[PDB]
Ligand binder design. Structure first.
Ligand SMILES: [Cl-]
Ligand SMILES: [Cl-]
Ligand SMILES: [Cl-]
Ligand SMILES: [Cl-]
Ligand SMILES: [Cl-]
Ligand SMILES: [Cl-]
Ligand SMILES: [Cl-]
Ligand SMILES: [Cl-]
Ligand SMILES: [Cl-]
Ligand SMILES: [Cl-]
Ligand SMILES: [Cl-]
Ligand SMILES: [Mg+2]
Ligand SMILES: [Mg+2]
Ligand SMILES: [Mg+2]
Ligand SMILES: [Mg+2]
Ligand SMILES: [Mg+2]
Ligand SMILES: [Mg+2]
Ligand SMILES: [Mg+2]
Ligand SMILES: [Mg+2]
Ligand SMILES: [Mg+2]
Ligand SMILES: [Mg+2]
Lengths: 505, 504, 504, 504
């Protein structure tokens, strides 16, 4: 760690790959450390004698001589969302997990998986199983989708980032058997898909969790190269250095980067494409990549870049045809030094527009200006950018819901549908044109920061100045959901939605 | 652009030089795109048939068959200050501009000229004229002065700084005929004088409008060199680098400059004099030149701008009875490992020590060494201009500068100069009893006193660095160098300084 | 002062070494410029004729024909703490100083000595004396301790730091005779001890009064080397540079130091011991040594100053039976491109990781590595002094330091040492339940907890870097190292630390 | 709820009285819903076959065929503080609760009892038991104290205040058997004592949890009258209204109360004593009783609540050898036309004048008159409790109260009482030099000093109203009266005050 500030050396991530499979084993006959069962409120109904009506629960309780029904009533478990009962008995352990009533997939089944991972961690389980108390009326396909969402919840719920702390226990969880939901090639493909996405989500969490003295712009570029190296027959990489970006006239990006002489900036360009020669839709994913932003209360730095690189990691495995995807991150750290940009400075973006920098706490959007111009210059048809852009969007939508801004109603609809499929939370917000007048400069084409009221909107209107009108473009302000204050950890928010969006194109 | 942070390049200022002349042409006979008429409230009086009493306005109206009087009453124009009517008719365009009642020159005539420029801009006028509705009761001198003030308004009102905008429209205005106020050599000399002063005001606006990534200290020094090069027979230049200032023991200035290793400091010294060898009154003009101040301050370097603006004007005017030293200790106040910390104790070139209790008041540290330097040139009188305090804006608002001097006579000179230029300033007291609040427990003084009286203690601080045999006045111009309404620099100070120099 | 920022050059200190002695001379027979007398309220009792009952005061008044009793009653002097009467008469000058009632020693005697110094300074006295109005009810040992405390007050009271200002007169005080409190070898050894401690206290004041552009980390290292050089038979020095600290894995200290590329860091290690071979208790004194802290606070480096002060005193006193390690991890906390960011995770030399959630609390990071280094020297007991928190001043005010230890015995030793020194400190609890608020979501801990309990969690942080086998006390001295009343450093801590070392 | 603001009506509390007893029943033979076992880390040691070495745990595990040891290791339970395992099996339920290593009693046993209550609540248990895994090395007396502490944890842990919300289930807990710690009259008397103290602690929690629109000063007086009525042979009451306090010259208290014309003030005086005629030590307990303070802080009235709590406990316990005065000057601090302004000068009932420079510190004005009233009852010792300052929370965090006294003996009594009660407090210094910052330019004193030292100067203020012949300690309880974690009042202070009274 000789050249790392603070001499910090990340511990080697020693997480096992969980072995996940869908089995036809009867639930009452399954043997291992922990069985988790997802039950709705209706699944917990009892008869005249206070016995479970549900066949699976009735049988498990019988075999336990009424210990499961007794514990459940004593502990007031009736299958409400978030509730759980944990029962250790001779030969095994059962946890019932409440699904509530009328809970949406995939989110309910993600939660179920998360709860199963938590109960595994708290009992040092190695081999676990998950099932639903009832699958009546469900198609083979809904069941497949529930299985893959359960898998996702277990994998993401088992992740623990211990790279920067001296005391930790490695995860005990080695296998997951998903029961009752089908077997064979199709359900296994879907589980594999989920696993590919999770590996992207987990990369995103790691990139964000890591502090700026570890994930520098040069380190972020190396992560990009590692993805390309792993998937070199479908992903290529081009890393531009400051001098190359200067030749491309990226004055807004380079001005933000100028202070940080010790950790130089790198402009990251990955391109995914299968070598086959059918028609491909050309897409870009642009992520804000300030590895530190001068403007540890805000632990969301780089969430956007992380979601973009996480998506690349997923897509490298999934290998969709019919799409060409450009992943673009203008990476730098925003520091303070004699070589730095001052408030009031006027910088020129690579499309010639001039920006009066009235607020040095909003420098991220400057880097995005040049990244968006670059994306448009790759000849893409559609762009999504993700950025932790404003506090204002968290005032508006809270910690958990990202704001989506687009001139293009169709692309809004695509992104809303992708989020519905992934389970991620977002909400379209208006690009109210009248607010652009508040962004006028008395010397330059525009200022970089408008009034507090409307701030997430004028942030979006700012970015629009750097997007070719013929390209469809949506901006996702993810300041809130990239970081979980409760878990004190990154989420990798965005990856799953982006993957779904690419795949549905 | 290549070596500029943000890759930003100033667009070439493409503005035409307006052709200005005084002409004897009767106002009703004049032909061109726009005729602007300045009318007082009394000039707009009407008779019992609602017809203008004023002979010029009566004639124009009757020639337009009552269209001008009708439009005027409909639009409630009665000649009040700020009022205007704009009438397009076959063969031309007239705008009447209200002058109010008993309004002071040159400000009223500046405003008239500004209003004419604005009406030109909004009609794309190329050739305009301006006249007063009545000139009777004005001396030949006052008419001359009115003409030059009109010219000033039109020139300054036509200026638009589009250097950093990727889209803009070039001024259409090409010529101004000033009517009814006299013709011949004298009025033409006065108009030319106004033009020379405007070019200095406009340089000042440009220096301030430009951001710190464009106007660095090196660039400020180049602008000084360019003035000397343009007027080389009357203006000389010496630019001192950090190592030269160090030999001159400028520890206060060099401490402030120490952080900014990327944009090194330059100490600017221009000297104006005509090349004849008669005795000349020796003056200095010192301007605060922090191209950026770490402590939105869009008024940074307003002082230095006014000082260089004055040089530019004087280089053209060539006054014979004066030797003027223009002095700017230019640097940017940044943050870095090489920088001065709060608490540091720095030593000015006169040997006095300063405890720097507040790094938002570093400007005055640079002025300390600039003032000592000025006194060392052997001058008789110094004016410094500086955006020194927020306190002065609390005291006097955005539009009126504060003037501080121990020397009553110099105060009177500067008040008279501002009366002649039209600029707003107000003397403030150098209340001695407040010096006690500037005591240090370790050094000779601290740099920043309490908020109450802050502009006064700022002045008292500077007075520590001025030879008491030299007459010295400090002008705290934090407010009026920048117009929040126009979102632009004003070039405040240039016209007053030039009038001050000339009256010496 | 070519390489000093601001070109500041400290003036050469010209303080007299005061000649101090204890004499058996009758107070009324003593000859010189000023006689100061310490009188309690009870000492000032008068009889039925309004004459002093105190024998000494009665005698002096009788010599002055009632002038002293008359001046006293007119000026309402009754011996209350802080009161004084100053009477100039033919052949000399007397000042009576109030000691109050049941005031604690040595503080009451320090104050006496300070008041005698102040009266000497205000009358330009060269030769002075001090006596108590009454020594009834005092042991020989208490009188000896009173005498040395009076000497301490006079020496410290006569100090004036004029290194950074032009206007000063050198102290006139040349001698002090202490009367009525005994004579001979023992009292003289005590006075000498007090003098040695004062020279340390004065070094401490100087190191703190000097600004960060003068006392950089290199300069602080040179001060350490000078101490070792002066006392080279009992004090050794090792200065470690950044590369050596990196080999010792001091990632927390080096992270804080990384920004300040212009003034590099030095880790200072002094060791005191007499060359005799009796068993020695191994002690460490660790001082926070941020010469400037980016998080006007004038208390920077008060901890390091106390530690180096103590070394200076101990070098002269030469106690046997101790080996004392003096450890200061010196650096300045600046802002640059090379600097640590908030959120960075740094690794101390014991392997523990710290998530730096607040860059205003970097001082404790340097102490982490200093404390580990101290434990690695195999010491039995450590005291650290550090200006660690604002919270401790909220808690205990400007004058009383907070003491934090797991070790009840060491608390008792430090409380007793302060009792003997006269310095004010108070033990505060290391409430363990607060450690939970120092959890990180990524590292082993954060560096800053919530405001409530901030001095406690500061202490609990430091505890993570201290071997449990070692007894350890943390002293948060943010308040008393700097006197806002004097506008000067106090050298707080030196006298206590010397008493602690001596009582081991 | 016609006359209550907001029409709020407290729901009737329906808490079971838990039946508590000590039994000699072998733990393995005990029958009921839930058995909780307190185990230290050392208790959880295993042998070479991974079987519990502890005899009780070995036996229980053997009955459960290894299920308990297996669940324990799987769930990483090793007996650390806060840890727990909960195992439901045929015929019952066991919970193992970690006690950590060398944790102090009674706190460790309180926590045990709280964890047993929580497990009862989460499993709807009616009949529970608690035992220690090991009682080796405990005296009979320590076991008795452990049992009563366990009872206290269970009773306090089972409390839930549902008066102001619609959704709640009544506690299922009906009985507790305490096992392994002894049987018979002595242990039963101790348990009974703990129950009496709990009923006080619970009254305290209720008085604080209730909002100011429910617990007004009139209502607080009625609570006092209810206590006296319940225990009328040992507790008498006198409620003084505003007019009576005016005759007693309580200008400081009445000034604070003047704004609140809608909810008038009442001065509460309870007196406890048994009717037997042995010598009784006269004590006062004074509580701050601002039912609302205009200066969301949920700690209002925590002091008064502790005092009334103590009266409730003492009414049942009936100690001989004491007479205890319980004094609360109750009012609300509001804003109206009738109110006190900042700057007003008020006169306390001892004649001293106070310039009220800060209306956020009015609570101390009411205490001034309460303390004078207490001294006028001829008591020997006074403790006041008050949520006086934010400063004390900065100092000591949320959990530890600050204790201020001139009287070293009383400090020792209160520190010992807290030791016995388990409550956290810490003595802080009454640094006399800070009194100078409380000077007024017009009155005898101001009411608020500078932020630094604010808890100390608070104490020094209160001292002005205390007869020096009376021993007096001030407890600043701003932190621990309210638990942000529970979102509920704690009734902090009651148990300590009861122990203090009993040890007199
Ligand atoms: Cl981002
Ligand atoms: Cl931004
Ligand atoms: Cl929509
Ligand atoms: Cl300026
Ligand atoms: Cl300044
Ligand atoms: Cl320190
Ligand atoms: Cl710190
Ligand atoms: Cl101990
Ligand atoms: Cl209270
Ligand atoms: Cl209060
Ligand atoms: Cl005492
Ligand atoms: Mg698999
Ligand atoms: Mg990070
Ligand atoms: Mg012309
Ligand atoms: Mg500018
Ligand atoms: Mg001597
Ligand atoms: Mg006097
Ligand atoms: Mg210092
Ligand atoms: Mg009972
Ligand atoms: Mg558990
Ligand atoms: Mg309440």
């Amino acid at each position: 760690a000789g050249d790392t500030l603070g001499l910090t050396r990340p511990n080697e991530s020693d997480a096992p790959k969980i072995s996940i499979g869908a089995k036809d084993t009867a639930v009452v006959q399954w043997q291992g450390d922990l069985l988790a069962i997802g039950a709705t409120e209706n699944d917990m109904a009892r008869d005249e004698n206070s016995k479970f009506k549900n066949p699976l629960l009735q049988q498990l309780d019988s075999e336990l001589n009424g210990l499961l029904s007794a514990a459940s009533s004593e502990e007031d478990f009736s299958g409400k969302s978030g509730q759980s009962v944990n029962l250790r008995f001779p030969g095994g352990r059962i946890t019932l997990v409440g699904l509530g009533s009328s809970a949406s997939s995939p989110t309910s089944y993600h939660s179920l998986g998360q709860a199963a991972a938590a109960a595994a961690k708290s009992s040092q389980a190695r081999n676990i199983a998950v099932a639903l108390a009832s699958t009546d009326g469900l198609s083979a396909e809904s069941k497949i989708n529930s299985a893959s969402a359960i898998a996702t919840g277990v994998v993401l719920g088992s992740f623990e980032d211990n790279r920067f702390r001296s005391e930790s226990k490695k995860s005990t969880l080695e296998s997951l058997d998903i029961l009752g939901l089908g077997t064979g090639p199709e359900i296994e493909r879907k589980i594999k898909y989920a696993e590919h996405v999770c590996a992207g989500v987990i990369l995103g969490r790691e990139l964000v969790n890591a502090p700026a003295n570890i994930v520098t712009p040069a380190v972020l570029a190396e992560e990009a190269k590692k993805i390309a190296s792993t998937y070199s027959d479908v992903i290529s990489v081009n890393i531009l250095d400051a001098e190359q970006c200067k030749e491309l006239k990226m004055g807004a990006y380079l001005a933000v980067a100028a202070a940080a002489t010790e950790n130089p900036p790198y402009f990251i360009h990955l391109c995914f494409k299968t070598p086959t020669k059918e028609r491909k839709t050309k897409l870009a994913l642009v992520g804000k990549g300030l590895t530190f932003d001068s403007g540890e209360l805000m632990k969301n730095d780089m969430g956007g870049a992380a979601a973009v690189l996480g998506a690349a990691k997923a897509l490298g495995e999934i290998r969709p045809s019919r799409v060409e995807v450009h992943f673009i991150v203008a990476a730098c750290e925003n520091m303070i030094s004699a070589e730095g940009m001052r408030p009031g400075d006027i910088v020129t973006a690579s499309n010639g527009k001039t920006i009066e920098v009235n607020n040095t706490d909003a420098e991220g959007r400057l880097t995005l200006a040049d990244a968006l111009i670059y994306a448009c210059n790759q000849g893409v048809e559609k762009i999504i950018d993700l950025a932790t852009l404003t506090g204002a969007i968290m005032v508006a939508l809270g910690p958990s819901v990202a704001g989506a801004f687009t001139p293009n109603d169709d692309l809004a609809r695509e992104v809303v549908e992708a989020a519905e499929a992934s389970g991620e939370k977002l909400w379209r917000m208006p690009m109210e044109e009248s607010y652009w007048e508040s962004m006028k400069s008395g010397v330059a084409d525009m200022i970089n920061t408008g009034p507090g009221n409307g701030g997430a909107i004028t942030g979006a209107l700012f970015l629009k100045q750097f997007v070719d009108e013929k390209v469809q473009w949506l901006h996702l302000d993810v300041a809130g959901p990239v970081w979980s204050d409760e878990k004190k950890n990154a989420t990798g928010y965005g990856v799953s939605t982006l993957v779904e969006w690419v795949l549905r194109n």
